[model samples]
Target: MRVFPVYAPKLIVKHARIFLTGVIWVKDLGRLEFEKGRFLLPRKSLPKVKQAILELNELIEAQNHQTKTALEHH
Candidate 1:
């Protein structure tokens, strides 16, 4: 399943609440625990979410490889 690690900012509770509507549940509650981020929806929601991560991973890999090649040439 896809785990969306939500980084709760300081005192921005409204934004967090809005975000949680789309998502299933937050790991913690009440005041925003900056360290205690939330997870994504259930396994059912993973298909679309996984695709996003896959695409991001591919892009990141290409960027990292390109950076390394550039460093080697320099």
Candidate 2:
């Protein structure tokens, strides 16, 4: 089963702190919310971000499998 299926790959920032961020690569999830003097994301945004994470993982795994099969057969 998939988790956080509603997630949509994004960043979160509240109270001037970077809370969470999602990306294809672990390193891509790094800080990306440093703008102005205040946080770019609202507290309510975390859940949406969490949902996005779920979807990303599932899709990535699917892609990985496809790639593996294609390479192995050919």
Candidate 3:
């Protein structure tokens, strides 16, 4: 129906849930090495999905946050 619509990957769960809810999303299915009843993270994700991570702003923000080490300097 669609190619890649950027649904939501973090919403993916490794195992089935239950009661009709035990299922996977189309976005969570393709783009990786998937099989029947077995889902796993593919190595290619680091390269494929990686293209989405082009924000250098957040990278630097977190870097400075942790770089300070939270010592509560007075």
lDDT of 3 by residue, 1-74 (tens): 22334444332322221111322335633443323323344454655444422222233334334544555576
Query: lDDT by residue for model 2 over 49-70, one digit each (tens)?
Result: 4444445444444444444343
Q: Each prediction's Cα lDDT score?
A: 0.35, 0.33, 0.35
At residue 55, candidate 1 shows an lDDT of 47
List runs of model 2 lying over 4 Å from the truth: 1-45, 66-74
lDDT for predicted candidate 2 compared with the true structure? 0.33
Least accurate stretch of 10 residues (summed lDDT) in model 1?
28-37
List candidate 3 segments past 4 Å from native: 10-30, 44-74
Superposition TM-score, candidate 3 onto the true structure: 0.22
Error of 3 at 70 (Å): 50
Arranged by TM-score, best first: 2, 1, 3
Steric clashes per prediction: 0, 4, 0
**What lDDT score goes with residue 40 in model 1?**
29
Write down the RMSD of candidate 1 (Cα, Å).
12.2
Model 3 residue 10 distance off true place after TM-score fit, in angstroms: 8.1
Report lDDT (Cα) of residue 58, candidate 2. 49
Worst 10 residues of 2 by lDDT: 11-20
lDDT, ranked from best to worst:
3, 1, 2
